[PDB]
Amino acid sequence: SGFRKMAFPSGKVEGCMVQVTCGTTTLNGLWLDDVVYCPRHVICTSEDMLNPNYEDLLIRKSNHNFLVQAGNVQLRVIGHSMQNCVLKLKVDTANPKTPKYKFVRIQPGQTFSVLACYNGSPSGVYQCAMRPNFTIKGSFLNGSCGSVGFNIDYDCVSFCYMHHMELPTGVHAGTDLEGNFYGPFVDRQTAQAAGTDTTITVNVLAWLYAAVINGDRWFLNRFTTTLNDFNLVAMKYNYEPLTQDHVDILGPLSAQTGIAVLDMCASLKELLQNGMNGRTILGSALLEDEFTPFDVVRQCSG
Amino acid sequence: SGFRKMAFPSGKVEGCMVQVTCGTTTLNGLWLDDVVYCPRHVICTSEDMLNPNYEDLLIRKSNHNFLVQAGNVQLRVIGHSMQNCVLKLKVDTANPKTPKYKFVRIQPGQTFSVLACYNGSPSGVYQCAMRPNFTIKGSFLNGSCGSVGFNIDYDCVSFCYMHHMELPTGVHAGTDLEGNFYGPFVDRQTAQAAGTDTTITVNVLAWLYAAVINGDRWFLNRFTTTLNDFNLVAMKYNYEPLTQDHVDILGPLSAQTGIAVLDMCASLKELLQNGMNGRTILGSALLEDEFTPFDVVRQCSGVTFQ
Ligand SMILES: N#Cc1ccccc1CN1CCCN(C(=O)c2cncc(Cl)c2)CC1
Ligand SMILES: N#Cc1ccccc1CN1CCCN(C(=O)c2cncc(Cl)c2)CC1
Ligand SMILES: [Cl-]
Ligand code: NA
Numbered sequence: 001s002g003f004r005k006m007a008f009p010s011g012k013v014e015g016c017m018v019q020v021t022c023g024t025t026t027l028n029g030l031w032l033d034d035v036v037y038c039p040r041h042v043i044c045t046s047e048d049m050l051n052p053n054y055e056d057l058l059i060r061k062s063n064h065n066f067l068v069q070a071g072n073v074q075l076r077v078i079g080h081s082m083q084n085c086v087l088k089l090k091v092d093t094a095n096p097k098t099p100k101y102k103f104v105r106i107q108p109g110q111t112f113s114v115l116a117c118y119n120g121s122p123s124g125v126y127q128c129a130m131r132p133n134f135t136i137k138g139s140f141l142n143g144s145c146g147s148v149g150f151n152i153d154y155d156c157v158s159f160c161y162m163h164h165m166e167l168p169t170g171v172h173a174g175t176d177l178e179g180n181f182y183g184p185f186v187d188r189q190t191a192q193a194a195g196t197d198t199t200i201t202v203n204v205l206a207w208l209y210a211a212v213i214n215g216d217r218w219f220l221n222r223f224t225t226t227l228n229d230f231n232l233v234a235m236k237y238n239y240e241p242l243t244q245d246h247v248d249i250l251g252p253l254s255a256q257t258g259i260a261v262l263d264m265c266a267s268l269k270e271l272l273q274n275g276m277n278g279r280t281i282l283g284s285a286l287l288e289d290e291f292t293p294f295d296v297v298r299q300c301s302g
Numbered sequence: 303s304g305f306r307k308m309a310f311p312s313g314k315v316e317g318c319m320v321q322v323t324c325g326t327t328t329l330n331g332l333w334l335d336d337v338v339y340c341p342r343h344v345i346c347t348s349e350d351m352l353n354p355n356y357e358d359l360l361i362r363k364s365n366h367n368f369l370v371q372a373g374n375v376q377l378r379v380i381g382h383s384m385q386n387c388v389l390k391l392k393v394d395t396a397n398p399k400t401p402k403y404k405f406v407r408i409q410p411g412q413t414f415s416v417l418a419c420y421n422g423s424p425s426g427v428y429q430c431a432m433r434p435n436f437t438i439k440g441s442f443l444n445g446s447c448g449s450v451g452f453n454i455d456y457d458c459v460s461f462c463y464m465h466h467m468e469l470p471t472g473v474h475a476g477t478d479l480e481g482n483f484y485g486p487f488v489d490r491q492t493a494q495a496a497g498t499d500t501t502i503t504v505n506v507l508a509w510l511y512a513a514v515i516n517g518d519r520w521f522l523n524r525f526t527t528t529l530n531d532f533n534l535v536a537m538k539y540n541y542e543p544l545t546q547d548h549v550d551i552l553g554p555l556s557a558q559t560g561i562a563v564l565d566m567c568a569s570l571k572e573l574l575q576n577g578m579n580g581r582t583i584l585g586s587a588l589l590e591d592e593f594t595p596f597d598v599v600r601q602c603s604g605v606t607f608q
Contacts, residue, residue, distance in 0.1 A: 001441075001442070001468060001473070002439060002440050002441035002442060002472060002473075003441055004428040004429065004430075004439075004440065004441040004467075005307060005428065006418070006425050006426035006428045006441060007309060007314045007426060007428070008426065008427075009313075009417065009424040009426065009427055010311045010312050010313055010427065011311075011312060011313030011314075011316040011317065011424075012313075014311050014313040021551065049323070060530070116308070121308075122313075122544050123311070123313065124308035124309065124310065124601070125308065125309050125310070125311050125427055126306040126307065126308045126309065132384040135303060137306075138304050138306065139303075139304035139306040139583070139601060140303075140304060141303075141603055166303060170303035170304055170516070170517075172304070206508060213474065225418075240315065247372040255352055278587060280588070283588075284587075284588070285437075285586075285587035285588050286582075286586075286587045299426070299441060300422075302425065302443075
């Protein structure tokens with residue numbers, strides 16, 4: 001029993017973290033085979049950040065301008081190129097600790113583990129969700145750029161996030177490993193803001209199923225609802241719409257607990273309309289939306 | 303900025319996890335140098351569990367009755383001994399991935415990372431605190447015994463917990479790496495229950511200081527309190543007493559934010575009386591007690607957002 005925000009074991013990713021230095025800037029890189037991946041903003045000075053022309057800044061750099069340190073060993077940079085907002089530094093040694101991996105782009109609502117790093121050294125691991133507004137509520141300080149997000153699908157690491165910046169509200173923005181930003185953000189010091197966020201409905205339902213599996217049932221009721229009436233309520237409370245795809249994905253949890261998805265939707269409707277009335281669910285006074293249906297099944301059954 | 307429940311990177315511990323089998327029972331073991339540590343209850347049947355005589359059960363076992371599997375490799379057991387509630391299996395290979403490590407016994411209120419494992423293979427990592435009633439609120443299923451708790455302040459792993467059992471209320475109990483249980487618990491299937499738990503006051507204060515460092519001051523007030531009046535009020539909400547040791551430990555956070563410890567105590571007294579009135583603190587609608595003063599300093603910026 002028990003239910004905790006759980007990250008994947010980070011060992012396979014720790015063996016890939018390196019320190020990348022360009023001029024006075026030091027940040028983190030991901031070393032896979034003979035390539036080190038890092039944010040392209042490593043080549044910028046503070047003044048360049050206002051309106052950088054990355055192609056022009058890069059042409060002025062030689063391979064020896066990039067210092068890559070893996071533990072206490074210097075790696076030799078033998079090539080460099082850009083792919084979208086990530087710099088790819090070709091090195092002379094393949095990482096002997098390279099795990100089986102893929103680069104995947106995740107959808108809003110999906111969760112992943114973040115390995116926070118400073119000077120190429122891992123400092124902590126925590127679980128995040130890609131918000132509907134394409135930000136992540138992480139915990140990052142100066143020097144954390146290049147820290148990565150991932151999931152592990154068996155023995156294969158799926159890298160899905162690389163950290164680039166913090167927005168004025170204290171939330172975080174980054175790219176996939178192909179350098180495409182999540183959300184309408186850019187790698188330049190211009191005015192940017194997180195858009196209004198919404199709650200991930202399918203994940204709140206998954207967490208209510210986790211609460212039932214763990215013995216917390218007070219919120220269950222005799223009522224059911226239709227998908228259309230439930231979505232009229234969800235919109236009023238700034239919850240994402242629930243689709244038939246979401247209902248299908250919750251199928252297994254519904255079968256195990258004997259609570260149909262629309263039966264759980266009626267409990268959620270009541271919680272949104274009346275609050276918790278001084279009670280908690282899995283030790284929380286708010287409805288948690290950062291556990292996917294898969295996360296619940298993986299932790300509660302495996 | 304941001305504030306999350308953050309665990310230590312688990313790689314140094316993943317390289318130590320093995321599977322231990324004795325008869326039909328399989329659980330996890332920790333392989334450090336040439337010794338595999340695991341719960342001694344691996345030698346019990348379900349019937350043995352009511353009143354096991356571990357010395358009598360162990361004397362009937364030979365080294366070859368213990369099967370230890372590290373990845374896809376079988377390790378050879380060449381010795382065995384019991385130390386309190388842990389079994390120590392001497393093996394013929396030293397773990398080449400053994401990190402720099404130590405065994406530390408922790409006090410209530412201290413936090414640590416748990417690497418949940420099943421069949422010697424890591425499943426997930428999360429942060430836990432040793433509750434005042436000597437239990438932990440973890441996430442463990444059948445097969446998780448032998449999973450360990452640790453901290454990694456620097457490059458040295460400090461192992462502080464080994465998982466043995468789940469109590470009737472769904473909370474968890476275990477030992478230090480010398481086999482001494484935390485709390486009054488025993489490794490037998492008798493009626494035992496967790497004592498009434500309380501909130502870890504020093505950690506809630508640490509977390510209020512984290513909220514101030516990150517730019518939030520809404521909960522502060524113009525008042526102060528004496529330590530004794532604070533404790534009289536706190537104990538009415540089932541909060542642990544705050545001692546002069548706790549006040550001293552909060553000194554650095556107090557100096558960084560400019561808020562005296564007893565002034566933060568007055569804010570906590572008011573939050574206990576009023577609740578949050580629809581507001582949140584670091585994204586929570588409840589007062590958080592599983593971040594120590596040391597955890598706050600590790601994670602937070604050294605510059606407060608004034
Ligand atoms: N791309 C981009 C971008 C876009 C707008 C502005 C600034 C940047 C880059 N910028 C500069 C490098 C240093 N930096 C951190 O190291 C950092 C990371 N996360 C959290 C914190 Cl508090 C600090 C901030 C990010
Ligand atoms: N020591 C002790 C003790 C003392 C009282 C009763 C039972 C035990 C041992 N017992 C038997 C082995 C299997 N088991 C789990 O694998 C387990 C762990 N954590 C959580 C869950 Cl749900 C299950 C339960 C623990
Ligand atoms: Cl301690
Ligand atoms: Na219902």
